[PDB]
A paper describes a structure:
All [name]∆N maps contained substrate density within the axial channel, which we generally modeled as an extended poly-alanine chain, although additional side-chain density of the substrate was modeled as arginine (residue 5) in the class-1 structure and histidine (residue 3) in the class-3 structure. Substrate was built with the N terminus facing [name] in the class-2 and class-4 structures and in the opposite orientation in the class-1 and class-3 structures. The class-1 and class-3 structures also had density corresponding to a roughly globular native domain above the channel. When contacting the globular portion of substrate above the pore, the RKH loops mimicked adjustable structural jacks supporting a house during foundation repair. In the symmetry-free maps, the unoccupied pocket in each [name] heptamer was always located between the pockets bound by IGF loops from [name] subunits E and F.
[name] subunits consist of a family specific N-terminal domain, which is dispensable for degradation of ssrA-tagged proteins, and large and small AAA+ domains, which contain sequence motifs that mediate ATP binding and hydrolysis, [name] binding, and substrate recognition (Baker and Sauer, 2012). We describe here near atomic-resolution single-particle cryo-EM structures of single-chain [name] pseudohexamers bound to [name] and protein substrates. These structures show how asymmetric hexameric rings of [name] dock with symmetric heptameric rings of [name] and reveal how the pore-1, pore-2 and RKH loops of [name] function in substrate binding.
Residue numbers in the entry:
A (entry chain N), C (entry chain H), D (entry chain I), E (entry chain J), F (entry chain K), G (entry chain L), ...: 2 to 193
B (entry chain D): 247 to 414
I (entry chain E): 247 to 413
């Protein structure tokens, strides 16, 4: 169930869902696992805001345990293509792919909650078949791992060698540590 | 009493068509047998007017009924020539005071009839066809001198050419 | 099924669902298990009320057996960030995470029903894999347990040592004991 | 499917569902098992009626085989908190928890149908784990059983000792016996 | 799917579902198994019609293989409580509980279709547990069987001894036999 | 999914589902298995058309593999009770019960498509229990078999002895054979 | 999900589903397996267009892997009965029954896409029971196979002997081969 | 869930779904596996846009792991048939069939994101039955493989011999390599 | 009779600019590349007005029709110089009584036209752009003495600069 709200306007009264009301203010929600259907829905929201106004900042709240990589990369390339600065906020948790979209936001407009948590690890996969096919899928996932580390260093500012060592296994980073790591810019402790 | 009842054709059609025809058995002639507006008014009756809004008490005071047919391409040509108050004779007198003659060939009348029927306005929608064509000509007719006669060809109505002018 | 109600207004008559009517009065319902979808829905409700009025108190009724920790911490940080005082009320039951959001309300505006019940225990988890990975997930859940006890002491006023001993195992607290424990302020027995 | 009805009013015609129409007349339906979702919905209905009119009697029709205890106690505390007298009627059956909400209605405004049936037994539960944890959950359910018997005696007027013996095992009570037992006030055989 | 119909009225045109249109004419449908949800819906319909007009006959069409007993007895007591005469019609089949609501209609306004079929048997049940608990549930279902036979005799006019012998096992009754048995008044073969 | 259509009327434009549009023209669709829910829905449609116009023919298109017997007999008695002539058409297939409602239509207004197919067999059943109960259900299903053959002969005109031999096992009848058999009147090959 | 479109009209703006918009232009979609519900839905669409205009061509786009035979024959007889010429187009694939409706279109108004594919085989079936019943169902399916080949020859123009040999097993026909085979008239490569 | 947006127009305010709003601007989304239902939906969108404006470019965003071949070929033939230039964009991933529709776009209006990925392999299939039937289905899938390679060379510009060697096994192509391979024209890194 | 008809162009456009179906076989008419509000109203007819809401009888009483082309950017500049009722001439005479001259260079007029079309108000709401700029100048004009000329540059419209006054 989704609650309905009333937006008081001069023309008259209009009924909106809670998710649609925030969309009017350039706010998008990323909830649950990242899949092809959920990822394709957020892309349409960003494009709709681009046409309405290309000079207003967009806010993306992320609360997700991660998911498919290819589904997440479609959002990252979209954020960089469009002109507006996509501000990112981490609520609850940010897994491997959720963390990549978090740091990929516009510099200076990235925040993390005081009790939020970020986790980063290497890509996961698998295949069953002939040895020749396993070698092909192994080379492909290796390129993605290398490509994902290159972009992580670009936005975080760290060196590529450091990202390779830190992403070999699961690594949890608290909200203060994320600032020191270049992943985010500040913390939204209280509203001033 | 007389007034063009708008929408009277739709109510009469239900009484005379007798069927929707969405079923297998029921027949369907959407456009082949579509009722003609002229013929339809001939089949009017007092019960049809009750649905329209008239009261039976009002119709009983007016037993006689007169139905009129719509204008026809042939009828429109006669309206411009036989009646003394025709629009053609009106413009003929408008220029007679100016010392200029007016003419209207038959080729132009046939084109005017087709343009008037498409407007779905009748005889009253004829001046729009004439004055819209002779706008440019009338605007610069007084300034011109030594002009004694004007001829309007079929092309003038279409707008491809201009009305030929004669000089005395 | 949700019953529909009519809100008589000067402009005209409008039809609302029972949940949406209470939302108009700055009232949010927390029902069932705390998950990423249910938690992300309540956050949007709080922000909507903040924009409509930042000086009016918000009321949060909680009836939940608890759930995911990361989903619940997003709500706690939101309540502290926004300026309005989020009043909390316990209806039926308040588990580990439901109790944490209950005590996190504004001081002096926390209530518990005469027959309500609160339960608190330590975080639950588990992992299957290599020994190196088990050590990582064990250290992470240990930090959360320590962090959840630190915040519990801040709002309840008790010492960190007391929360550690009381949260080692399940501990049920009646409505009178919750007041004596600093978890709540009073009991709403009757309407005065 | 829910049938739709038309409520003829001076302003105009309005379409309502059968459940919403009765809600306008201060009537709430309690159907099926008592759970956290169904219980939280009825609470919002009672509060809505309180604001519309605090001096008009509310009618609660109960037809339920019982369910969760914590979900039912949220309804009981609400009926006692609000000022209006919550009239209760038993249709079909009233199990352990359905019977507790039945007798909890306002004195003198409790009815039972001529062929209705009430059933009362002790709380049900269970746990799996260490012996130390079983002792904790055992003490808690024992308090609820004692608390549920104390309140049952308060509204029924019987002694606490009598309720303990009668609730040791399942006990069915016909409609005439319920009047003699103090559970209800009268029977609505016919409309006079 | 439910077809929509248009009710031509002086106020304007209105769209109604097929089930809601007949409800406006004091017609209720009893389809499928008798349960707590389906039974509680029909009760609200009867009460709604009572308030609209207490002097117009209500028509109840029954096509059901039976179901829960407690759910059906709520309808029977309601039909007897309200003042309007609840006319009953049997379409397709009328099982044990469907037959009890059929004969419970107003005398002289009970009909059965030429090819309808009625079936009557004894209540069904079961229990698993201690011997002390089995005796309790056995005594309860025994009272219901005796109670259901007493009421069956009251409306059918037969003796209690005859109903006991005929309900020991399944007994099917054709439409003509039902008239001779006092269960119904006549048969609606054709519309005169 | 159901397509929506627009019915151009003098009052204005109205949106209808494809099934509701045909219902306005006295057309009912019988699709899928015959059950208690689908059968009870068609009965309400016939009654609705009877009140709107009792002198206009109704058209019933049947495409069904059959189903419950009791659900189908409710439709047969309804068609015979009401005054309007219920025209029947067979599309695709007409099983045992679908064939009985097909031949039960008004005499002279029964049609079958050039490639339609009809199938007739005896009633199916079964029971598990004591020998005394098996004898009861056997006598009941035997009466139905005898009753179904008597009515089939009445509308088809054949003798009861012929129907008994032809219904002992599955018997398929092509569209031309159905006319010779008295099941239908003619075939709607083309629109003239 | 179905996208919504806006049809700009002189009266005003109207919102339509993508499937309903094309229906207004005498366009029907045949997607997925052919069953009794999907087949009965298309029949209502054809009849609705017949009443609106009996002189305008209808277009039927088919993309289906086939299905039940009896469900498909109802559509074939309808196309031949109604006066309008039902134009058929093959998109993606056309199985046994999808191919039969394709070739059954009006002569000269049948098209196939350059990369479309048609497949034809014999009817499929099966039965389990006594030997007497297997012989009955075997004779019935044999008539259908013979009947389906006779009609296939009528529209394709080939001889009955050729269709029997080509339909003994699965036979795929490319788009160019379908023209040479008389199944279709031309190919809609580009829009001229 | 799909968020709703408001498109401000001179006539008034209208509510649209996020997918329908982008459809108004000649934008179609291809998400998930390519099947008969999803493919038939995109075809209706292209035809609708063709009638509205045949001179404006259409944009097709593709994010799909591929699927059925016959479902995908219906889209390819449609794009070539209509006059408007169908621009294609690859987001996230483009498998065998997703890649064929990508390269099938209008020459000079094909783009790939900087981090997008394309994968190409041979058609997949299988059959179980007699050896004679396996040979038929084997010849059919061989024609498709040959046909799919011929068209791939036509749009990519490579030779038929090269496509056969590169499509023998899975082959991943990064975004830069796709430009050099003739599959696409450029990369939409930033908006200029 | 005269008046603006909002939404009419859409009705005429739908009727005139379409001859195509949405299916495969139906041919697609390529048209309506530009709005062409001036050239579209010229193609009006009585039947087009019936759909709008007018009655055919009322239209018959008004056979002649006139289509007024909309305003253009360059058209606004001519409106402020050629006609005697131009606002430039009005303000010019407003200061003539004070013994002061006024000027309006083309650099300022062309910029004002862009402001007007941006506002979607037309020539009627053109004064707001002029008076908004000459507010401070007019406010201190009577008290000022020994001033014989005032020049308004393009910068003055943007507000970065103030009009140049000559003593």
């Amino acid at each position: 169930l989704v609650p309905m709200v009333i937006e008081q306007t001069s023309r008259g009264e209009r009924s909106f869902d809670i998710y649609s009301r925030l969309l009017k203010e350039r706010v998008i929600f990323l909830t649950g696992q990242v899949e092809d259907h959920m990822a394709n829905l957020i892309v349409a929201q960003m494009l709709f805001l681009e046409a309405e106004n290309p000079e207003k900042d967009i806010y993306l709240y992320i609360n997700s345990p991660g998911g498919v990589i290819t589904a997440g990369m479609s959002i990252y390339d979209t954020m960089q293509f469009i002109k507006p600065d996509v501000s990112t906020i981490c609520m609850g948790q940010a897994a491997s792919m959720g963390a990549f979209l978090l740091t990929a936001g516009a510099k200076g407009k990235r925040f993390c909650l005081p009790n939020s948590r970020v986790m980063i690890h290497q890509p996961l996969g698998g295949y069953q078949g002939q040895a020749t096919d396993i070698e092909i899928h192994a080379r492909e996932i290796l390129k993605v791992k290398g490509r994902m580390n290159e972009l992580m260093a670009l936005h975080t500012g760290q060196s590529l060698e450091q990202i390779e060592r830190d992403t070999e296994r699961d690594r949890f980073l608290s909200a203060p540590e994320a600032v020191e790591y270049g992943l985010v810019d500040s913390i939204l402790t209280h509203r001033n | 009493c007389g007034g063009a009842f708008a929408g009277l054709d739709k109510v009469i059609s239900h009484r005379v068509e007798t069927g929707s025809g969405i079923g297998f058995g029921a027949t369907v002639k959407a456009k082949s047998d579509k009722a003609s507006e002229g013929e339809l008014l001939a089949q009017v009756e007092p019960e049809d007017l009750i649905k329209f809004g008239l009261i039976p008490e009002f119709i009983g005071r007016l037993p006689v009924v007169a139905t009129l047919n719509e204008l026809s391409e042939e009828a429109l040509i006669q309206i411009l020539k036989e009646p003394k108050n025709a629009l053609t004779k009106q413009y003929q007198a408008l220029f007679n005071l100016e010392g200029v003659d007016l003419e209207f060939r038959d080729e132009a009348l046939d084109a005017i009839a087709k343009k008037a029927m498409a407007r779905k306005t009748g005889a009253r929608g004829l001046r729009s066809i004439v004055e819209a064509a002779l706008l440019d000509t009338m605007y610069d007719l007084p300034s011109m001198e030594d002009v004694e006669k004007v001829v309007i060809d079929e092309s003038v109505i279409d707008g491809q050419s201009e009305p030929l002018l004669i000089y005395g």
